[PDB]
Amino acid sequence: GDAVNISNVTLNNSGRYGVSIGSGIENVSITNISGIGDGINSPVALVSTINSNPEISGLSSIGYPTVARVAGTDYNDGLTLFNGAFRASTTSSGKIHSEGFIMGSTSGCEASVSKSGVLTSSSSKTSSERSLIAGSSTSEAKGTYNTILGSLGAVADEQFAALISASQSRASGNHNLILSSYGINTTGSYKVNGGFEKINWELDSLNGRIKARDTVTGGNTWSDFAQYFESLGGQVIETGYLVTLEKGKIRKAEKGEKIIGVISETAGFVLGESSFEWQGAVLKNEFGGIIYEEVTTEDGVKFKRPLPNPDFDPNKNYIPRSQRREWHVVGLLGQIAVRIDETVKQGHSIDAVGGVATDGDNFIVQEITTPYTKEKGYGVAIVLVK
Amino acid sequence: GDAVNISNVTLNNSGRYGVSIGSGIENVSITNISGIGDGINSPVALVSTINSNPEISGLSSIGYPTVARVAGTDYNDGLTLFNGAFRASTTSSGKIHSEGFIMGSTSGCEASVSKSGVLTSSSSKTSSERSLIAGSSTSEAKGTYNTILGSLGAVADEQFAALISASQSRASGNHNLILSSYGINTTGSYKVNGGFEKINWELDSLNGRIKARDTVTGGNTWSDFAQYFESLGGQVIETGYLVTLEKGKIRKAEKGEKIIGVISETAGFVLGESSFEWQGAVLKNEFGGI
Amino acid sequence: SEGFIMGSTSGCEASVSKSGVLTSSSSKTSSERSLIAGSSTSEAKGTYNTILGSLGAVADEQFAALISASQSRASGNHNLILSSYGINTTGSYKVN
Ligand SMILES: Nc1ncnc2c1ncn2[C@@H]1O[C@H](COP(=O)(O)OP(=O)(O)OP(=O)(O)O)[C@@H](O)[C@H]1O
Ligand SMILES: [Mg+2]
């Protein structure tokens, strides 16, 4: 049998399976069924359905171990199930696919393909398989795996392309996301983008690049451009000390020696952290440049991969240079705090004795910020290092 | 009384409360009720329900000040209310909690806990309390406060962990977000991450750090690395001027004096903006370190 | 009438046209064209707001949004907060 309505049914201790729907049935409606099964010999389900396309609402029972068994799944306190195109709380809508819905939406919102949906939106369309549009207006999704959120006049027309808080904007890249933007058209793969009329910033997930059209800023009050150096013998060198090199490693600078910088605690920009992985995890040429292979992913993504170093051991638990003792942030350029002696004057230059500034030939003393005292054995001056 | 169906009812000037459901009632169904209340002496509600678990659809009326009062709340133009597990416009589904739903979804989408939901997705599972999965495939959420959007083979298994436009990826950090990524496993707390096979960029909300595996670029045509300096006497020094220092402050450079730089209008990278707060808002040591 | 509440608990409210709440507890939207999902103690009150996977989060300006945010407020025009705790934000076209 098929095409049957079962509504407003009460079962008082009647049937181990209360309502039962067989295999291959396309169209059944079950509403308002309530059963009692205390006095039944081994009751199973109040409602039972072998396939998933009967429609069900208003189920309650006492004494049945399962209120609903549908397509081999218990819904122990009942189910509300509708099949086909769905629409709730909307004023008007265009096309709705059987696996699409429109909710809380106005003026011709449309979800025309499988797994496409529109929420709380006006005049928005999706023909994207696996997609969501929400909190939006004049918007369209037409690729696949698209989400559009809190957006006006926004288009996502490529796979995994997405827009959040965007106006008059189009995301056309593979895995391409636009945020907090007005009037931008975007195309990169694995890119996060923002802009006003033109693209203004980019987070490139593919190559690991960060781009700003204008400035990048970091740091506080007096800051510097810095680089990680390794200390000779693995010593700790405190901040404010002038360092030199010996056997490729840093130590406190002595008389007549070249000052390469100052141990720094206030870098805005730093190089050579190895924050992600161990430094030798990737193959590098003789100049330190990464060696690559061109890979074309099964899908179609055409990228280049850094070559793995065979000597790399994924067992070894990586501790970054920022946590190691021997590795020091050394300020190379900028306004830097330096340990001085009694001989150092504002507006003058400095040489070094035991890593401590003495009157000399290098750089410029900007201002003494902590005057020398016999008891401390040093003062502190801001030195403009270049 | 309990377990009652009220359907296809028309009230022509009959009852101040049209349909009334008392306290402690678990199971009532109300469909297709239409009332007229012009000629009633002080009508209140077409439908009235003291608790929230009767189910309601197809309500209309004229002359009633409230079409529906449910659990002390007016729904003045009617309500459509279902309770329990919900499913609409989907081909198949696994487990659905009474406070879970599956919509516009295919092949065994499951929402097994309170406040878990799946939209427009295939073979996706959430057991995350307070979560959403949408526009997705082969995906799983299992922490709390997880959203997964436009994603394939994506896992969120920590609190507030989230993924948008991500492939074959896992976010395991506290408040940890992955964007526009393929094949990355992520763990930091208050981190935003992107990558292809390996993590390639990070926005650290916790410590205020920005990290790129490759390059950071800024600026235009001819650019420079720069720093904020304060002018002696508070003068304005125009761009293109060579500056020196005197009493820790900049002025135009003179003969034989040390040139420290040029007033710049085209910096790509700059230090010491104090863009966020006043410079002295935080305690610093003798070397300027926080 | 153009709002909904689904998979939600304790007094979730969607009081305006095109406002909706999903899988959330004690969350309110009075934002026209908005969504709150996977959330708790949260409120949207501007326009074009989405709040996702958030606790004690407020969006009270147009296109302001929060994802994976705690005890946080986005008040800027097209202003987005990510992966954050205890921040109040105000810039226009900013991600914070
Ligand atoms: N061959 C390796 N494979 C994987 N990890 C490694 C390897 N060698 C070292 N590490 C990791 O790097 C950390 C210390 O680095 P180590 O000094 O041993 O080598 P390195 O190449 O000198 O590193 P760095 O130059 O960063 O100091 C350790 O925590 C260890 O886990
Ligand atoms: Mg080493």
Describe this entry's structure for a reader.
This is part of a larger assembly, with 3 copies of chain A. Chain A is an all-beta fold. Chain A has 3 domains: 84-217, UDP N-Acetylglucosamine Acyltransferase, domain 1 (3 Solenoid), CATH 2.160.10; 218-274 and 320-386, Virus Head Decoration Protein, Chain: A; 275-319, Rhinovirus 14, subunit 4, CATH 4.10.80. Helices cover 0% and strands 51% of the residues of chain A. Chain A has strands spanning 4-12, 17-21, 28-36, 45-49, 55-62, 66-70, 74-75, 79-82, 86-88, 93-96, 100-103, 109-111, 116-119, 125-126, 129-134, 140-141, 144-149, 152-156, 162-171, 177-182, 185-186, 191-196, 198-204, 209-212, 216-218, 224-230, 242-246, 249-252, 261-263, 267-271, 292-296, 302-306, 327-340, 349-353, 356-360, 364-370, 379-385. In chain A, the strands form 6 sheets. Chain A has a 16-stranded mixed beta sheet that branches. In chain A, strands 26, 27, 28, 29, 30, 33, 36 and 37 form an 8-stranded mixed beta sheet that branches. Chain A has a 4-stranded mixed beta sheet with strand order 2-4-6-7, with no helix packed on it. The site of adenosine-5'-triphosphate has 12 residues of chain A, from loops. Adenosine-5'-triphosphate is lined by residues 274, 278-280, 311-313, 316-319, 321 of chain A.
